[PDB]
Amino acid sequence: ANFTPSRLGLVNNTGTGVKDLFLKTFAGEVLSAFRKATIFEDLHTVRTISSGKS
Amino acid sequence: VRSQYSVQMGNALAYTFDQNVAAMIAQAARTSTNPNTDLPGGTRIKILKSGTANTAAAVAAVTGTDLATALFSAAEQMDINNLPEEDRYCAIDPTNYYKLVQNTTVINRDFGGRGAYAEGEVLKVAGIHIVKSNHLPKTNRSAATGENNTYHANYTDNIGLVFNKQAVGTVKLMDLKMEQTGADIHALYQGTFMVGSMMHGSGVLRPDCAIELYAANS
Amino acid sequence: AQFPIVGLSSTSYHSPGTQLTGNAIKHAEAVINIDDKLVSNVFIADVDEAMNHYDVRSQYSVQMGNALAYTFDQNVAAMIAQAARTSTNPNTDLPGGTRIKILKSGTANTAAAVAAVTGTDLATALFSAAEQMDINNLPEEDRYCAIDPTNYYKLVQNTTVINRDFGGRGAYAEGEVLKVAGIHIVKSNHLPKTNRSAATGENNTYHANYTDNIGLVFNKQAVGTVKLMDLKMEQTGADIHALYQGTFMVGSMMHGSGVLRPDCAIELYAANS
Amino acid sequence: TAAAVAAVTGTDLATALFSAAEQMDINNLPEEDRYCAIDPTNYYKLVQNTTVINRDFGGRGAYAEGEVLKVAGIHIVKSNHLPKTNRSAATGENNTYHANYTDNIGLVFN
Amino acid sequence: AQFPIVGLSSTSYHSPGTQLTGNAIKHAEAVINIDDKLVSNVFIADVDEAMNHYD
């Protein structure tokens, strides 16, 4: 031993819980979700009209 | 957060379009009579299972041999209606796909090959390309506001679709668009608003180029 | 936001040839939350602006800024009182808050005791607070006392607080305005004098019973504030004008206040037996 | 008991690998970089199953070289650090590593 | 350290003339703690070193 640290995290030097005055930080990366495969866009007929209801 | 919301909205629109297209293909498969009286109509193939009442136990009991026989019957039906021998497709879900792959006959290079046990894939059976999709119609559907075409039916016993490129068509009027408001909306409502919208419609063209595979009892 | 607090060390004599080990220092923290958004708004039609003489934009902006400042002051004063009412410092090495009592009646805790305070009791309480501030090892600069006009002009007429111009510098250094033996005495109308209830949108503890309050003796470090967005003025003139003819103005600000050091605050209050 | 762990054969491992591949497909995972960590005993129990190395269907293996490389689209690697014994909490760990891993066989991850 | 997660969105139909309001998005996070410090050490003498013929 031969040393007595201050521990910098205890409050009032009493009890356990030596990580009470430390904060949590932003890692830097956001997870989000996966993109499902979409195959029906092709394999069918696509047309386009400039006016009209049908 | 404004970089992820745009991706999520675009993905949601694409997923909705895919689900609608698949539902329309199934509906074309279920059409008994062609709009033109002379031409033939759609046809469904039934996998008999047991004497049980109509339940999902029949869907859960399907084996790979039944799937192979159903695919061959579908190819026969496609050839009866004088369809071309190119661009035939089959859409199946991962459970049935991997029940089919483990059937070693379809990947045997000694007969016809076109598969790989190591890669865990099958590519072609009876001349029909095989693909996987998670957006097949597998529930019952109810009519919703804003739908001018009939998308609703009961798809509880669906297994897969065998179709062509000419079975279903779509019409587009307005393309995709992304908009965001920040000039005066910010002061009235302390915030920001983002939109994404598009307009189109889908329908059934040729009922005779679509086939439905379903599992039920007597 | 978090404000860490560091304690104090100790010393001893060394015997030659022996290893040094070291002592420990106490630590603590003070946390201040952030409240909701505070807004002030108004709407002016187009006919009135067409028919008017002078400019109303600047006057309205000034009035909005003044209102926001008044609310901020009231919150800060309530926080100073709450700091004075804290018995135990978060860091054990440091002392806590104090309250000085003035006995002035035979009834229960009432308004007669508050209305019956004379100048001699005020001078005695002032000097007691000064002694207590000296005991707490507070710095000699920036010592203040806040008191309302009635008690202010009750106290100024007293003959003891005269001819005591010495002490620290502090603010209000423009010549001589207000000073008693190092304490600067100022007037304010925003002291907490009524018992206060909780309001939605406040994420700190401002509510208490302040009906016995008389004055506050404090320092510059008793209360702290944390600003997230500073003061900002906005105005809409593009599509609002077309939708409904007129102009809209907003003024908003975001912050929060809390207690930092209860040993830098003292409160004077009047009660009975 | 460990008697169940000691009775596993290669057919069970192949079936489990196919089930894992199907479940990965359901969860919308990408089609590349899927791994399977397995200990030498189960690795050489799986190699002895001639179907998984049969070049008639898919190949990707060798009985003489004593290796199998890919099953159902999943890469297969060997490791000696798989968790197999129940673990107790030790001082200095600020996470939760302790559990009862006595029934572990393999891991399929990403 | 904290890793935030973002969920999926939805779609609907618009009636002409009315105003759009908006939908909600699910949120969560994952946290990873920091362990203590691992060490490995050894001490080599000089006489015992001289009782050696290799390095």
Residue numbers in the entry:
A (entry chain C): 2 to 55
B (entry chain C): 111 to 328
C (entry chain G): 56 to 328
D (entry chain D): 165 to 274
E (entry chain D): 56 to 110
Please give me the paper's original passages concerning this structure:
By using sub-particle and symmetry expansion in the data processing, the resolution of capsid protein (gp19, 328 aa) has been improved to 3.2 Å, enabling the de novo model building covering nearly all residues (Ala2 to Ser328) unambiguously. The whole capsid of P-SCSP1u is solely composed of 415 copies of major capsid protein (gp19), exhibiting 60 hexameric capsomeres (hexons) and 11 pentameric capsomeres (pentons). Similar to T7 and the MPP-B cyanophage P-SSP7, P-SCSP1u does not have decoration (cement) proteins in the icosahedral capsid. As observed in T7 and two cyanopodoviruses (P-SSP7 and Syn5), each asymmetric unit of the P-SCSP1u capsid consists of one hexon and one subunit of penton, yielding a triangulation (T) number of 7 for P-SCSP1u. Each capsid protein of P-SCSP1u contains four distinct domains from N to C terminus: an extended N terminus (N-arm), a long-extended loop (E-loop), a triangular domain (A-domain) and an elongated protrusion domain (P-domain). Although sharing low sequence similarity with the major capsid protein (gp5, 385 aa) of the bacteriophage HK97, the P-SCSP1u capsid protein gp19 presents the HK97-like fold, which was first determined in phage HK9735 and has been discovered in many tailed phages and herpesviruses. The pentons and hexons are assembled by similar intra-capsomeric interactions, with A-domains constituting the core of capsomers and E-loops wrapping around the adjacent N-arms and P-domains, forming a circulating interaction mode to stabilize the capsomer. The inter-capsomeric interactions are mediated by mutual penetration of the E-loops and P-domains of neighboring capsomers and further reinforced by the extended N-arms interacting with multiple subunits to fasten the adjacent capsomers. Overall, the capsid of P-SCSP1u is assembled via non-covalent interactions to maintain the high internal pressure for DNA packaging. Consistently, the Dali Z-scores revealed that seven capsid protein subunits in the viral asymmetric unit of P-SCSP1u show higher similarities with those of T7. These structural analyses suggest that the capsid of P-SCSP1u is structurally closer to that of T7, rather than two cyanopodoviruses Syn5 and P-SSP7.
